[PDB]
Design a protein around this nucleic acid. Structure first.
Lengths: 50, 79, 189, 298
DNA sequence: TTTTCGGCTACTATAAAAAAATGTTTTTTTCGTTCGCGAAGTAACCCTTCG
DNA sequence: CGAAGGGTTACTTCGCGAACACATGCGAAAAAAACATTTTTTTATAGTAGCCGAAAA
């Protein structure tokens, strides 16, 4: 498993809050359109849509 | 039938040579120190299917025993 | 503690028949798959509390001694008047001391006293009570040089006869193997 | 032991050549269940172990030795007599170290201390093979199998026996001293080479029987056949049965010593292929294209 | 019943040439996250021929 | 008239790529052999592990 962690960016307090609470994935580098790239309607309150 | 045909095909074969004469039961092994283990319960219900079997007879007349003694038990139950 | 905390001697033997059973007793060897299976035994016996102690500074060899008995000293002067500087016999003559500590006792008694030791080497007493003490306090047989020499010669003769019989049996087995090889060569053609 | 008299019963039934009929009689004498129980106890008292076959139960094997004693060689451990019983029934050649590693799934230094503690009382008397793939050693006694009459015979007396059988077949299938010079060789060979024309036909083993050194030199006409195969693939033709025909290189390298001196008869033809003598090219002299031509490290 | 301060026991170290019984580290044999297109092994069916 | 000798189209499995910049021979049983330990002979010397008696209450 490569790329588990990350050095803590302190550009702002928003950076230190938003680099946490991050959902990384397994489909990291694959050029597929409308697959695991377009967000789904089951995200109302679950994850941020923007 | 299928095991019987394979045993009959394995009958009178010359492949069991003179190793059958010097068969020894001296193959006692130590307990499974951290190398690989025994069967150990994963197939014990699969293994015990030929060790014993009971011949249980038919019933054909049983009416009194599991009907009237059940009501006699209510005479000593008393709520 | 085996009586307290807990048959119980569930162990193995020199043979394969270990348990209970040697095998199945119904028709044939049934428990040979279980008899062929050491590290499952009785060990939950000796329970003792812990500590955080130490043994450092110097640990290993040493000498646990005491202030010596003056009656042991009188016995030592009587022994040296009777049977002198005989380190192994002196270590056996006191059979609850040891060897290096009585050697330090030898050099200590060689240090301080010339008079009684000179009179002791003057005395030349014959060793009978020393053998009396060595045969009672140890209960050793002390068979003489003729009996022990004859027993050693008989053991050497028995060992030589066993070696000669083993060599003759090996030669007979080699001759039987050569005859069996000749018979196999005759039966191969 | 001293349980009951059934140890003496086991000795009396294991005196002669035994089989399953001996155990049939032993179960036939008294009532069956007490006999089975006490026989299981006697087999738990370091005795013969049963054998699983098509037949019910067999003995192991025919003798009443009964020597393991389970506690007394130098120390007390219930692991050593086990390993001794493992090397009792090794068989013909022996047992590997990897085989005894594979069984009982133990460590290897306990096998080394078994080696030492049993070598301290002479039960590790091994027999060595010719080759050593995985140390096929440590049998019981007598150095019996030896896989070795010509295999373990290296090296000098194989050459000595080869030289003397070459001399004997050269003096049998051809006359003795007519290979030295060309002054009428062999006299119209074997007197107009017809029906005399003989060879050994077991006479070579009779000549071996005339003289040996008595170590490995009793060959049952098979090591002689092995040396026969060793000689007809280099310098003998051997038309079908036993007619050797030693010639076409025997004369040259037999009579080169004190039979072919200097100042001969005639100069030789260029590039005689069947000739190894007088081929030298340099004191140092390797300047130009002399005989330095062959294969040139391609 | 508690502590402390003086008597013995004695083993480490270096140096000696003395020589024997026994245990101590390297080697030579053997092996268990696409998709699209182009090219290369095994079958189903005709053209032709001898016994 | 039927078995056999090429001869090809058809199904299946194996080789490459995807932007464009930036600043982040190895392992594992043993085997001949060159070798030290381990002595005991003191023995000078300090003290450091462990052991009881004259001192105070």
């Amino acid at each position: 498993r490569a790329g588990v962690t990350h050095v803590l960016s302190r550009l702002s307090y928003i950076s230190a809050l938003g680099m946490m609470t991050r959902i990384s994935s397994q489909f990291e580098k694959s050029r597929k359109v409308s697959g695991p790239r377009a967000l789904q309607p089951s995200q109302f309150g679950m994850l941020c849509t923007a | 039938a299928n095991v019987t045909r394979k045993q009959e095909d394995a009958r009178r074969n010359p492949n069991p040579s003179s190793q059958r004469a010097q068969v020894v039961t001296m193959s006692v092994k130590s307990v499974n120190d951290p190398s690989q283990n025994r069967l150990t319960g994963s197939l014990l219900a699969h293994k015990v299917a030929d060790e014993e079997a009971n011949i249980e007879l038919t019933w054909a007349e049983g009416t009194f025993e599991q009907f009237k003694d059940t009501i006699v038990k209510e005479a000593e139950d008393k709520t | 503690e085996e009586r307290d905390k807990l048959e119980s001697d569930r162990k193995a033997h020199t043979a394969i028949q270990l348990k209970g059973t040697m095998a199945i007793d119904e028709e044939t060897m049934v428990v040979d798959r279980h008899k062929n299976a050491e590290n499952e035994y009785k060990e939950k016996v000796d329970e003792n509390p812990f500590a955080n102690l130490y043994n450092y500074g110097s640990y290993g060899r040493g000498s646990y001694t005491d202030p010596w008995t003056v009656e042991e000293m009188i016995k030592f002067y009587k022994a040296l008047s009777m049977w002198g500087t005989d380190f192994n016999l002196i270590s056996q003559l006191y059979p609850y001391r040891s060897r290096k500590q009585v050697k330090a006792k030898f050099v200590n008694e060689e240090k301080k006293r010339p008079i009684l030791i000179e009179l002791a080497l003057r005395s030349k007493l014959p060793p009978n009570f020393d053998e009396y003490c060595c045969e009672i306090k140890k209960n050793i047989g002390t068979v003489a040089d003729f009996n022990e020499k004859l027993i050693e010669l008989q053991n050497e003769h028995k060992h030589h006869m066993k070696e000669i019989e083993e060599a003759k049996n090996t030669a007979k087995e080699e001759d039987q193997t050569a005859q069996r090889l000749n018979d196999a060569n005759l039966n191969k053609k | 032991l001293s349980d009951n008299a059934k140890t003496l019963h086991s000795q009396m039934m294991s005196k002669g050549i035994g089989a399953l009929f001996t155990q049939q009689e032993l179960q036939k004498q008294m009532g069956i269940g007490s006999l089975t129980d006490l026989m299981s106890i006697v087999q738990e008292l370091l005795d013969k172990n049963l054998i699983k076959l098509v037949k019910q139960n067999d003995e192991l094997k025919f003798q009443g030795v009964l020597e393991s004693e389970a506690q007394k060689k130098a120390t007390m451990s219930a692991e050593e007599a086990l390993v001794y019983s493992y090397i009792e029934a090794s068989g013909r050649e022996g047992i590997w170290s990897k085989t005894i590693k594979a069984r009982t799934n133990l460590h290897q230094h306990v096998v080394l201390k078994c080696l030492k503690s049993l070598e301290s009382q002479r039960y590790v008397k091994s027999v060595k093979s010719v080759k050593f793939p995985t140390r096929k050693i440590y049998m019981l006694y007598s150095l019996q199998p030896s896989v070795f009459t010509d295999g373990e015979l290296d090296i000098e007396f194989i050459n000595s026996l080869l030289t003397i059988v070459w001399r004997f077949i050269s003096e049998n299938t051809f006359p003795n001293g007519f290979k030295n010079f060309e002054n009428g060789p062999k006299k119209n060979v074997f007197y107009a080479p017809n029906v005399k024309n003989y060879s050994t036909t077991q006479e070579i083993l009779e000549f071996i029987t005339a003289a040996q050194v008595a170590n490995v030199e009793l060959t049952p006409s098979n090591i002689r056949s092995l040396c026969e195969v060793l000689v007809y693939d280099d310098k003998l033709e051997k038309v079908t049965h036993d007619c050797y025909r030693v010639t076409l290189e025997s004369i040259l390298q037999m009579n080169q010593g004190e039979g072919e001196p200097e100042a001969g008869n005639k100069a030789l033809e260029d590039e005689e292929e069947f000739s190894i003598f007088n081929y030298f090219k340099m004191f140092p002299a390797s300047k130009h294209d002399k005989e330095v031509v062959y294969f040139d490290e391609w």
